[PDB]
Amino acid sequence: GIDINHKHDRVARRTAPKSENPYLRLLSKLYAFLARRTGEKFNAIVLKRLRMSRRNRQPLSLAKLARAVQKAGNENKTVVTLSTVTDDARLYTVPKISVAALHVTEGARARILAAGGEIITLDQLALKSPKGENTVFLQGPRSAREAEKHFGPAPGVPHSHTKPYVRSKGRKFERARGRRASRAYKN
Amino acid sequence: KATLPLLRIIEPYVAWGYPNNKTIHDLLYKRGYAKVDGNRVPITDNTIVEQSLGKFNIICLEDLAHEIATVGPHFKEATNFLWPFKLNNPTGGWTKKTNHFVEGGDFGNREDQINNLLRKMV
Amino acid sequence: VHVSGTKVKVVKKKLTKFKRHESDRYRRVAPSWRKPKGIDNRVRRRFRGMRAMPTIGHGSDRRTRFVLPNGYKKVLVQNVKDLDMLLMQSYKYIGEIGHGVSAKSRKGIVERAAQLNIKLTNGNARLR
Amino acid sequence: TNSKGLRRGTRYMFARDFRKHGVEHLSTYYTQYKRGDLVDIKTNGAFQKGMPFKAYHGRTGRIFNVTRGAVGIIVNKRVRGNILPKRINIRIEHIKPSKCRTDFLNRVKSNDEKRKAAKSAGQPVPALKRLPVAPRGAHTVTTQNNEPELLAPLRFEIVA
Amino acid sequence: AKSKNHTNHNQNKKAHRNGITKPKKHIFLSMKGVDAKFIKNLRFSRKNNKRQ
Amino acid sequence: PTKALGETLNEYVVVGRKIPTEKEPVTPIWKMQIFATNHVIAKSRFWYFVSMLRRVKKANGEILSIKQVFEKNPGTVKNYGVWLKYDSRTGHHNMYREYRDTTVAGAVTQCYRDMGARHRAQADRIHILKVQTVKAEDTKRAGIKMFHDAKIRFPLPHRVTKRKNLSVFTTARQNTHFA
RNA sequence: AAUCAACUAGCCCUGAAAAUGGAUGGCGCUUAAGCGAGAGACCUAUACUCCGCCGUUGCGACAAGGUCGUAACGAGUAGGAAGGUCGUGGCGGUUGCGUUGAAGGCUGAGCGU
RNA sequence: CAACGUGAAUGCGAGGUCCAAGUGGGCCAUUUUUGGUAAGCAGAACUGGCGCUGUGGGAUGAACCAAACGUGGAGUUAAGGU
RNA sequence: ACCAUCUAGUAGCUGGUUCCUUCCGAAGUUUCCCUCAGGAUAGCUGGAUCUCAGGCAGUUAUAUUCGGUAAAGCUAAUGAUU
RNA sequence: GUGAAAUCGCUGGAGUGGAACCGGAGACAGUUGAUUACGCCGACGGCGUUGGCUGCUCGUUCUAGCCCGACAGUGUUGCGUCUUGCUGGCGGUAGUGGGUUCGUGGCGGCUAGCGUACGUCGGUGUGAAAGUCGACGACGUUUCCGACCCGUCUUGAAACACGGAUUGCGGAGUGCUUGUCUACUGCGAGUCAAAGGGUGUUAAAACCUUGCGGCGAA
């Protein structure tokens, strides 16, 4: 007998994408090879984000892409993101962007190409910068989800701003007792 | 003073003493294993020692033995580089294992008699 | 025996079957193994003198697992075309004609196997 | 079960020391407290206002607020498997500066001064680590005027 | 059928099962519960300090 | 508890002293004669007795020297007197016993065995106050005195002899008398 | 030529009576095979050391939903997960067998923990 | 902003979020301890166990002593014994 | 009363709850409830993982502190008492 | 049609002292395999690894005794501050010289399990068949060790707690509405489109079709 604890012996991890998409699996294969051989944490990050679940890859905004590219020194670097690149109607001027991504929406692609930009795939990025040179790694906001709005301390505890699960919205839906001092108390 | 209290706390469960030259050399040569990336690797060559302790000028089993015996400036690294020794049961048996050494038993500080015990255990 | 094409001995950790507890006492209890779930089940609690339970530790060697006592591995063939997959590694695989193959086709299968130098486990069967 | 009043079981905890009752000396109020300082809590029964709870008596905390005549303190409290940093507003009379932190600050000051002096004078960097007391070294003992005394166990005597 | 039976037998073991979690180190940075007048003055001071 | 393990307990001389302090820069040196199985037990019992006698314990003291004492002439027989204090199940008593041996350590071992045999007293309940060599005419125990006779003679009346490396059964007759 | 008195504590004895025939476990054991102090040797675990195999975990190599290497590890009720070329009945497809004998049924040679 | 650079021992990778099961009759032991004449009784404190657990020993035993378990082999032992 | 239907009436209660291996692995405790054979709640547990690559520890050392139990005292206050 | 299990009768073999069944390990009966080199088995050597038992020989630590000198004593021979013995410390140690302690010592002897730096060799197998050899030996028999009846509630079950005489077949976390989280897929500030309409004859499908509607964007 040996006095050790086995509760945390096994670590849950994704050794390959849960997706059955053949192209996603091929990309995971390619970047597993690249990470293993080049030994670059950039390739490791790309592999991990390829194998991640779609929940962890929130959509990215063309406004964020433009902001990243406009910063001093980033004008010529290639922006790499495993998140879908969406179009931002609030963005009026779009600079020249060189982006490698899994998926780019129609409007964002049209605007990027019209502005003189370039869109490539992850394998093309592998051919361009096998070690990730001259890259700007970006992703969408992970905590910006309606589901995440409901996470945290329970709505009925002090100093809690968690969103409750309510059938509807109105004066008749969980707004009387425990929400205002005129009814018992307020938290 | 920072280690003796621990020995007093664990008195009933350990037998300890003052190792000598032969004891240290036998332990390092017959049952020497290194912790290399979390793996128990037998020390069958001086290169194994040099790879990990070469930074501190320990390059051979003799250097490691000297460090341990004289409690050199790198005793911590030298010893933590060694996997805990996994000894055999003594040939001849124990005595009581439930009473102190001075009670005719086994646990506690047996001083230099640990060498006699290890001559059987190792 | 040694695995064909190799020199590793085939070792069987156990030879007896893991019979279901009380299957000898009751006829309604089939001998096929079932893991005991009872709270007081002595076999489950592993009392001394009780039948052992299946465990992964009993697993046979990876190199010798699935190897017949003659040293080959069985491959099931249903027609003459099925003899091709046995052609390359004929030194480690042995063909077995499917139970459903009639005597009319077994004849051609046996002749073709003999021509190709592929061993059969049941070549001399179903002769009319 | 026990009653759950505020001062249950504090008969001796909140009492004054023998021959120590009466007027409170004024160094208690003259002492300077600043946010970030460590202070020990020892309730003074003579001041029923701003009293700490019995569970914080004898505990050390860190000041985070300084009011006219009180201070806000963050004190660690054990609740099941978590240690909560509770915030309590205690008056000055129940508070005393903690000496452990000031001793550590003095040690750090001395370390920096020694390092600076050695560097300026060109000496090697001196050792600035506390070390556990090492085993006694080798020495010699003389018996001159100190001849050994032979000791033996004494016989049993009936002491009525 | 008495059924009060209070005890504290296994509670320390349960608490230590996952380790006793000490408080974080950023708790001393927040200015929650600090004097309103001091906070007001601090806000005014921070609003006016010239960056360069 | 303490046990007198090992045939023929060894004898050690142990010298120690309280660790000097500022108020007591020079400390008295204490010396004892202790019979124990080995030197670790010797030191333990030394500190036991010294803590009993003087305000000092192992933590505040040190062992200047531990040495073994060997019988000067194990080729001669002596009478040994042993003054001891021991505790029964009811009270505490002082005993004076006498033994005949070629070694003081052997005499003390005999004393431990004899106390175990006759009073069911274990080694932890016995303190050996003193051990000395007594002259023939200063002895006062009949068992020892009856052997101070130059004309001593006696046979071996009923000798039961044990066969060692033979079969259990035999046709030989067994003889217990040897004239 | 030792004697007398009062104590003391080891073993033994008295104090010590229950109902089916019965319990140091039994037989038995008396310079013990009992009581106390000890010594050599010896016996024996799923414990310790080493050796093989199975699998888990961590790490790693290899152009692969795979193979391999390597170190440590392997208790389990309630309960939770994973793998199942474990098994059953359909559907859309695919691969084949069958009056020279399918399903079903009885039962030897093997395979798989 | 300028300088200074890790300031006790030993061991070791650390932290975060979400979803959810079963449980919410306990019992035993060293020590402490309340009610009771006591109880294999009732009620508490610390720790370890059984419950959930097999294995060697105590002739037998949920808790005692030793020691925790893949499947095999050689050697050596623990408690206990010859 | 009997017959059919509402009606597969409800049950905090009793009984049963059907393949194999692998890994992890408890609780009988807190608070509220016409609550005490039951629930909700926190605790204990599993899974999914994600962010990173030195700050932690059911252990010690140093420094500083808290306590009024054992012991001690009543030829010291209170209460007994020769 | 097929024709299972429980249950039952016959023939032959074998066991059979107040249960019977069962796990581990052999043996027997039985079943089955068998192409100089090679397969299936054994023996003796070598080597690797883990050992078990047992001796000598050097030294090391702490220490003598024998031997010599004075003194003190006496369990004392032979014939009295006698002598011979003997003892005690004390002082010497030249020579001689054993105990105790172990060594990062030196040299041996016997022998075990596992694997194969590998050798020396025997059994058997190359048409049947018989024999021989090898492996199993499974619900047959016999031995040695272990071995209480399952499921369930329970702190606790082999229980003098409940259900269970035997066998076959059937037999129990489902459907749907509504939420939430998680995994995957498409598109993405959008997305899905309803009823409906148009078309479609392998026409309940598929395909086309929305100023407006749901959710989201405050």
Automatic annotation (TrEMBL), chain C:
GO terms for cellular component: cytosolic large ribosomal subunit. GO terms for molecular function: structural constituent of ribosome. Keywords: Ribonucleoprotein, Ribosomal protein. PROSITE patterns: RIBOSOMAL_L32E (PS00580). SUPFAM superfamilies: Ribosomal protein L32e. The keyword Plastid does not apply. SMART domains: Ribosomal_L32e. One of its GO terms (biological process) is translation. PANTHER family: 60S RIBOSOMAL PROTEIN L32 AND DNA-DIRECTED RNA POLYMERASE II, SUBUNIT N, RIBOSOMAL PROTEIN L32. Belongs to the eukaryotic ribosomal protein eL32 family. This is 60S ribosomal protein L32. The gene is rpl-32.
UniProtKB/TrEMBL annotation, chain E:
The keyword Ribosomal protein applies. Residues 1-24 are annotated as: Disordered. GO terms for molecular function: structural constituent of ribosome. It comes from the Eukaryota. GO terms for biological process: cytoplasmic translation. The keyword Ribosomal protein applies. Keywords: Ribonucleoprotein, Ribosomal protein. One of its GO terms (cellular component) is cytosolic large ribosomal subunit. Belongs to the eukaryotic ribosomal protein eL29 family. This is 60S ribosomal protein L29. It comes from Caenorhabditis elegans.
